[PDB]
Design an enzyme around this catalytic site. Structure first.
Site, mmCIF file in Angstrom:
data_model
loop_
_atom_site.group_PDB
_atom_site.id
_atom_site.type_symbol
_atom_site.label_atom_id
_atom_site.label_comp_id
_atom_site.label_asym_id
_atom_site.label_seq_id
_atom_site.Cartn_x
_atom_site.Cartn_y
_atom_site.Cartn_z
ATOM 1 N N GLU A 187 0.930 -1.120 -0.108
ATOM 2 C CA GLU A 187 0.012 -0.036 0.041
ATOM 3 C C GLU A 187 0.812 1.334 -0.158
ATOM 4 O OE1 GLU A 187 -0.507 2.216 2.669
ATOM 5 O OE2 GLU A 187 -1.911 3.430 1.518
ATOM 6 N N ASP A 192 -8.302 0.942 8.163
ATOM 7 C CA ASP A 192 -6.876 1.501 7.910
ATOM 8 C C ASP A 192 -6.885 2.450 8.969
ATOM 9 O OD1 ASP A 192 -4.407 2.424 7.036
ATOM 10 O OD2 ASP A 192 -5.225 2.973 4.934
#
Ligand code: AHN
Ligand code: ZN
Length: 313
Positions: free
Chosen positions: A156, A200
């Site tokens: 990511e 997240d």
């Protein structure tokens, strides 16, 4: 409050009681809190840890890697997403996702281990899968037409903050890969995703979440309702006000993340990310000692109820 589609209190309390806070912390979170930049030994070891933990679940998940090599500002790097699908035969799935890589920083500083970003997200997914394992196994044995999928995405983070293509390596790859693979009814694995919920930046004290997508606001309202209900039922800690996490109104801000490659392909998304970000964001202080354990477990409880209501567990 007991709304239509919510758990009866007895089933709520059973579900919450199947969570094990010590297991979440020691079995699932602690082993992840290492440097795990793409291509590193630590990243490979965390990948293998995720895979083996998921394979161990008695429900019998289909677990596979999505390995690939991509160009980066550091040259070619290998990435590997961990893809766990409880029942690969099912028509569709709820997909929960997070990233397992850690952000690369220059040598010579305290190593960055991304406790909120996203070790806590990863550990939450493992704990939900374990705590609900019997129920998930039964659902699968009953051929439920909506299953569960967990994605642990690699890459990511930017490797060198080197522009817009130095990011989202794993999610960009996996969304393209899923678009290319047939599924029944599908017609591809993208259309099997009934909802993509991305976790997240979780585990800091005082998170705030907003609905980023009008399309999925009904699920955001369910999360908020669950927070209020757990508060009222004396099941949250360090939570003095009835609603603290799930805030109404326009987001404080929205941000690019691993949901974007899916969103662009028409997948419905709920982005469960604190905005504002944790105080420690992208500093080496994003560590275990700066997590707020009661918040971690509060989020775990909210998510467990959410999952059980979504999948009728
Ligand atoms: C615009 C932006 O920085 N999006 C990435 C949010 C983030 C950072 N680390 C984890 N998630
Ligand atoms: Zn980050």
């Amino acid at each position: 409050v007991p709304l239509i589609g919510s758990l009866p209190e007895a089933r709520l309390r059973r579900v919450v009681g199947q969570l094990d806070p010590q297991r979440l912390w020691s079995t699932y979170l602690r082993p992840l809190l290492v440097v795990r930049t793409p291509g590193s030994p630590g990243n490979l070891q965390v990948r293998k840890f995720l895979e083996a933990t998921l394979r161990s679940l008695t429900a019998g998940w289909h677990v596979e890697l999505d390995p690939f090599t991509a160009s980066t500002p550091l040259g070619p790097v290998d990435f590997g997403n961990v893809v766990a699908t409880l029942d690969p035969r099912a028509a569709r799935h709820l997909t929960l996702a997070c990233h397992y890589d850690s952000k690369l920083f220059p040598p010579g500083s305290t190593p960055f281990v991304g406790a909120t970003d996203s070790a806590v997200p990863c550990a939450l997914l493992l704990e939900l899968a374990q705590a609900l394992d019997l129920e998930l196994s039964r659902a699968k044995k009953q051929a439920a037409p909506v299953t569960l999928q967990l994605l642990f995405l690699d890459g990511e983070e930017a490797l060198k903050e080197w522009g817009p293509k130095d990011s989202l390596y794993g999610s960009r790859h996996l969304a393209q890969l899923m678009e290319s693979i047939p599924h029944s009814p599908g017609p591809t694995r993208i259309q099997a995703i009934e909802l993509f919920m991305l976790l997240d930046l979780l585990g800091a004290p005082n998170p705030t979440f907003y609905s980023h997508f009008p399309r999925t606001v009904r699920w955001f309202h369910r999360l908020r309702s669950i927070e209020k209900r757990l508060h009222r039922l004396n099941l949250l800690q360090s939570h003095p006000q009835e609603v603290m996490y799930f805030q109404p109104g326009e987001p404080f801000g929205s941000v690019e993340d691993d949901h974007i490659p899916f969103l662009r392909r028409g997948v419905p998304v709920l982005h469960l990310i604190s905005t504002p970000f944790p105080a420690v964001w992208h500093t080496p202080a994003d560590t275990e000692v700066n997590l707020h354990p009661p918040t971690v477990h509060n989020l775990c409880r909210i998510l467990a109820v959410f999952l059980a209501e979504y999948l009728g567990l």
